[PDB]
Amino acid sequence: KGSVVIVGRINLSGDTAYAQQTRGEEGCQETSQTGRDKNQVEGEVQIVSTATQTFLATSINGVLWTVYHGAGTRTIASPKGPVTQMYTNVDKDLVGWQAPQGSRSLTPCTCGSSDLYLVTRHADVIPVRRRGDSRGSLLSPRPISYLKGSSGGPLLCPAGHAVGIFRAAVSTRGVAKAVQFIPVESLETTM
Numbered sequence: 001k002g003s004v005v006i007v008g009r010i011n012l013s014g015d016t017a018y019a020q021q022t023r024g025e026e027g028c029q030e031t032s033q034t035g036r037d038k039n040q041v042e043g044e045v046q047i048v049s050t051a052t053q054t055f056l057a058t059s060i061n062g063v064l065w066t067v068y069h070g071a072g073t074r075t076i077a078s079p080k081g082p083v084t085q086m087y088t089n090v091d092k093d094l095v096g097w098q099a100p101q102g103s104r105s106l107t108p109c110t111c112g113s114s115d116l117y118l119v120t121r122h123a124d125v126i127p128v129r130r131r132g133d134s135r136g137s138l139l140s141p142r143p144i145s146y147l148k149g150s151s152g153g154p155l156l157c158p159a160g161h162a163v164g165i166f167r168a169a170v171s172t173r174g175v176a177k178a179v180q181f182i183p184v185e186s187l188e189t190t191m
């Protein structure tokens with residue numbers, strides 16, 4: 001199987017969040033096969049792809065994290081070739097690689113806030129009220145299509161620190177009312 005390939009990023013550096021593509025589909029396919037990606041990486045949230053799926057990956061404490069149901073056991077493409085996973089935990093739906101050079105890492109949240117913000121692959125910043133260790137409710141529910149492809153993205157606190165990794169959606173009749181996530185403390189324990 002090919003490598004996971006970084007194909008873009010969510011720019012959060014300014015006052016406006018927006019998605020940027022850094023590699024098109026043909027270059028993605030070639031890069032997945034070789035595992036050799038010479039593109040410069042920037043930012044905290046990467047848009048990633050395999051031959052068959054696209055989703056997100058988030059750098060926290062020097063590790064690029066994403067979901068097992070997107071990446072499986074795959075390597076990630078890098079300037080020196082394929083890089084093997086540093087963490088794999090199917091029971092948490094969690095994988096991680098060493099963060100690529102040029103990426104910036106989020107810091108784990110320590111403030112205990114229950115007012116969260118989910119960042120999607122379309123650079124929507126969606127307010128979420130935390131409802132448990134691994135769940136939060138959308139303040140404004142919306143069709144699940146708006147969340148598809150955003151697994152591996154971050155939930156952030158009001159200070160912009162990482163609270164969790166988006167894993168699954170709670171959907172009733174196609175409407176997403178809540179999200180389910182990997183708490184950052186599970187990542188910290190993994191580390």
Ligand SMILES: CC[C@@H]1[C@@H]2CN(C(=O)[C@H](C(C)(C)C)NC(=O)O[C@@H]3C[C@H]3CCCCCc3nc4ccc(OC)cc4nc3O2)[C@@H]1C(=O)N[C@]1(C(=O)NS(=O)(=O)C2(C)CC2)C[C@H]1C(F)F
Binds near residue numbers: 068091147150167168
């Ligand atoms: C394979 C999809 C996974 C499945 C089902 N799931 C759901 O969300 C479902 C749906 C009904 C919506 C389908 N909800 C749902 O279970 O809710 C109930 C409340 C929770 C409690 C259960 C959590 C289970 C998490 C999970 N652990 C796994 C572990 C190992 C594994 O090994 C193979 C596969 C695993 N699979 C898992 O979950 C996930 C999903 O779709 N995640 C999102 C996404 O965007 N993925 S993606 O980027 O498009 C992608 C698919 C390209 C990568 C965020 C949504 C976005 F769509 F909103």
Ligand SMILES: [Zn+2]
Binds near residue numbers: 109110112113160161
């Ligand atoms: Zn915080």
